[PDB]
Amino acid sequence: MRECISIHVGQAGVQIGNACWELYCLEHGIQPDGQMPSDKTIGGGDDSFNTFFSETGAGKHVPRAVFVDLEPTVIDEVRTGTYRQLFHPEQLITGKEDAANNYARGHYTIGKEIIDLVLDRIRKLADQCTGLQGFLVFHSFGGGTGSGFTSLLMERLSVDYGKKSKLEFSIYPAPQVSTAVVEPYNSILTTHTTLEHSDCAFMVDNEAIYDICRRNLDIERPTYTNLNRLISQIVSSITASLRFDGALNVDLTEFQTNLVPYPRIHFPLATYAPVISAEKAYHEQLSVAEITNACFEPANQMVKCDPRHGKYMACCLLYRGDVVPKDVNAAIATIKTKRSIQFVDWCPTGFKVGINYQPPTVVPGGDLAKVQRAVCMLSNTTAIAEAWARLDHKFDLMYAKRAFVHWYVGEGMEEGEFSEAREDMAALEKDYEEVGVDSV
Amino acid sequence: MYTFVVRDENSSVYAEVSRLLLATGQWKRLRKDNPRFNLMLGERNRLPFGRLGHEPGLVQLVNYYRGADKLCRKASLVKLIKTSPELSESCTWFPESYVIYPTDEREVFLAAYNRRREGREGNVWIALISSEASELLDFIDEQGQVHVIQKYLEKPLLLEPGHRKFDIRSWVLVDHLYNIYLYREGVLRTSSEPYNSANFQDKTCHLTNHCIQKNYGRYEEGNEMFFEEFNQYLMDALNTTLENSILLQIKHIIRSCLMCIEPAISTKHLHYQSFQLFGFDFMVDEELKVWLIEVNGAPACAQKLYAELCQGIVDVAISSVFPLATSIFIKLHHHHHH
Amino acid sequence: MREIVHIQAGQCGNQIGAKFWEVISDEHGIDPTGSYHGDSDLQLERINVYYNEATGNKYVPRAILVDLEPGTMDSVRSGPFGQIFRPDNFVFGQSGAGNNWAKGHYTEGAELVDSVLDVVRKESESCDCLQGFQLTHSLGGGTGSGMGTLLISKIREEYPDRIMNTFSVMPSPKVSDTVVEPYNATLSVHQLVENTDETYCIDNEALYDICFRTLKLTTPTYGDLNHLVSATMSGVTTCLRFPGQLNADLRKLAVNMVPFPRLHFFMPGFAPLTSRLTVPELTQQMFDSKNMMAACDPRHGRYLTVAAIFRGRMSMKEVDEQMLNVQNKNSSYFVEWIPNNVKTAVCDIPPRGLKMSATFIGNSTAIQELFKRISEQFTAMFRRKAFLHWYTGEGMDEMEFTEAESNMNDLVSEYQQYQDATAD
């Protein structure tokens, strides 16, 4: 038991969902029809993969997932695509008309028309769980559904499920692939509304993923397909603790204990290595020390910010593949001998480590080299606040003139909600300042 | 008591600045070779920048930016505009220009020139003015030192009554912090004798220098139209403003030129500080498109405006650094996100 | 699907309307009988945006043809794509406009308006998910201007949360001698600033000047002007018609382009200009005054928002680089207080005749030059009350001309206000 339910909201959440589930099926030996030959218990079980897949009596392994979008196009491609037999039609929920990059439409106008239906379908997955752990919510900050609908849903999930765990994977906007001038508004609005309802949120900077694809995979003009395949690997590394068992595996809840020192300070920085093309991986083993040291290079981060100018409050390492304790221990002892990393004075300078022996998988026809061993570091740095500051500045530039505000007011929102949302963000930036000041 | 030295006696602008500083009672002029100065009003040529900022217990300031000559020499400006990716070779506001040495880009000039002959389009250029290539190249080999062949604006904006050419002088002050200050008063230096499509011999209708204009003075005093009167002309005759039709483009051009060289000339982390007054020369065409002609490193002011500008220079360039015991400048700054 | 309902009103509206339908039918592989004989599935994927699917695998334009003169609508039926239109979508009057706005808006057009609404209703009522409405018209005449804006007002009453989009052709003395047009334009703009979400300003002044100066046409014809109007119309609707990420429907466009509700008048552009290139050239021409369909110099104000659509097989990396390039080199002409206000879309399918093209949609404060020009011509003949009796006769007070003059100058002041505003 310890079931997790994944909720994928809006285009970004949905398209990242596809890549994640595809990748999970490959990692567990599950076919596109849901059959999994290696699983000898037909109809159910309490194996580690059952945190994410339920089972039918016919041997079908079904994702514990809902896909929601206020518009049918993106989910229609899941309904007719390679993995259509994996999902029950009731898990794929669509409306007619989207939120038009407007939080207000996603939260209120359009969103309210489909919210009870979504809770209904979530409830059906919840009632098949013997010991539900919580939820993983995938969504963009920028979109109207991603921002506005996700917020509404998170609020409703707090009411219907108490303090049951809610984790976010949030796509942070970048100008190279953004489709809306108002994305800064939607980001601030959803972050304000969602902050009390989320236990842990992993921000994924599209600009960061865009640069990794250009620099490390030699991809000229990365598309969503390029970005999502890389994002998938990082998500897989994080959920691997839940989906696999192993003597040295540390559960994602244990990492959370270390990562969240105060309720609001729940945004860990993820860093992944190695990201390398097949052509470069040929005749090139990267050792444990090498991939570990790569976790401290900012170019490998999922968010653009500089932890060398901040302070650490936690540092977790999630290894997978051919990795043994001796090498991890030596690699980390070098790091602390060398310094390069400063902790705040109220936090001990530890490194919480997990290892899953099953090596990383890649999707056929992709860009990543299949390597023997990978690592995802989850750190809690004051630096992550840089990302809030960059968005908060863009917000202020527009809001001082009230630019685009009439689109939100026209759907029922008040200016009070904007200034309240922005003050909460100012408070969050101050919190990140305060935790990094030395104690008296 | 702050101290200064005057090392260019010919500068009308800084003669007034020294006068204003002495009048304050808190500045004292020293003799030109006394090195224990706060402010150097420097010479135009061979200014000893290497000697500045090596006097303990004195903050030192000078009225020139070392390396600002790259903007202010005609052959350097062309080269700067051609080689800097920020301005590029496809800069829309600088007339198509080529550097030409006497007995280099003469081969590249002739190619673009002899394309325009076949194209059946206006093919007048300037060093001075002629439409055939022979007279220009022959004038330079004979004339002397390095020269610039630049595209001559066939269709200028012409004032009425009188059908006259003009250029616009804008004064720009760059302070020690690299703030760019456009003085709110500029000036049109007008031709008085009517403009002529065919008559390139007579170079009083074609060249609008306050000296070369010598009829004269008919339409305005000393061939100087100021911005209030010129704004009114634009409103009456063309149904537009100076601000909208011309001044946005001037602002853009100035800010682009000075931002491009900022890394090469800023004194931000230097042992001495610089400020400098520039004079940008602009040409307006009949479509109300602005073009840069030149940047002058040691400009003079127009008689009416001296007192106000020079007191501005003291307030924002000198007294910002050396404080004593309504703003005439527009600060040029723009940070568009992309 | 996301369906749009097209409406074309008056002589100009129906002319440019007809050519719009010729061009996009060509692009989507639709012949005049309404059958698909194209080479690509990308032509059909979003065909339902503009076409109803009838029996026998046929496609009918969701278009409503309107005029107070019955003559102009005979010429449409006689046209190359005339047979494709739905016969009972033709709604025609008797008298004709007489280039009198009041006739179009209050009297003659008012009598006809319910008949148009009946057809609009029947198209709208059988839509899976209606985006909104697209009206082609001129502002200088009487039907397109006066009845067209009445239409707009009446459709808002019944579809108040739908997007109202116009292609509004502006008058120029260089194209038409009719002295009254400044009135018709000012009274129309008065309507459009209140009751549309997005208006493409198609300026005959600009279309004439492009033909005379740049294309070197000595006596430009309405057909020469409309070659530019149709290319503009194909370009600005590309994102609505083909699969894409950016500005893919009318509301998403409006949200990207309209920071203030009244400031919804766009300044389209196109490269290359032709009569009947590299990405850096397309990118430079797009932002240069020569290529604008409104007689405004963008260097005389600032862009609030911009959409740039590149059509053809080109490098997406090169476009990204050039679009950054143009923003850096022209930074002063983009408002600093709306970050990331220029968006870029690349559609692989090029338009007919060209191997690569670029379409520009700008919300510039420079558009005030257009409105000031109209305002000067209006106030020339309104101080002396020339030809007021044409409108007073139909029942209009003189005060409605003052209100409309004042609102159009309010709009001018507002563009200037946001032109002069800083981040500080």
Ligand SMILES: Nc1nc2c(ncn2[C@@H]2O[C@H](COP(=O)(O)OP(=O)(O)OP(=O)(O)O)[C@@H](O)[C@H]2O)c(=O)[nH]1
């Ligand atoms: N990494 C990644 N980002 C995406 C993807 N799709 C969209 N985005 C980003 O998400 C933001 C736009 O939000 P969407 O998720 O498309 O919008 P939505 O949630 O569908 O909301 P509406 O369309 O407004 O109803 C922008 O920042 C895009 O760059 C994707 O597949 N992968």
Ligand SMILES: Nc1ncnc2c1ncn2[C@@H]1O[C@H](COP(=O)(O)OP(=O)(O)CP(=O)(O)O)[C@@H](O)[C@H]1O
């Ligand atoms: N490309 C061009 N088109 C039109 N006019 C031009 C021009 N280049 C120069 N001129 C005219 O010539 C005048 C003076 O030229 P410019 O300002 O380039 O040299 P200058 O002022 O440094 C002369 P000097 O160095 O002897 O003082 C300008 O005011 C302008 O009217």
Ligand SMILES: Nc1nc2c(ncn2[C@@H]2O[C@H](COP(=O)(O)OP(=O)(O)O)[C@@H](O)[C@H]2O)c(=O)[nH]1
């Ligand atoms: N560009 C263009 N302008 C047109 C066309 N037809 C008419 N006009 C202009 O439209 C105005 C007259 O409006 P019109 O459509 O003839 O009036 P209505 O039919 O009574 O609405 C004038 O300013 C004309 O210059 C056309 O086909 N193309």
Ligand SMILES: [Ca+2]
């Ligand atoms: Ca089982």
Ligand SMILES: [Mg+2]
């Ligand atoms: Mg969407």
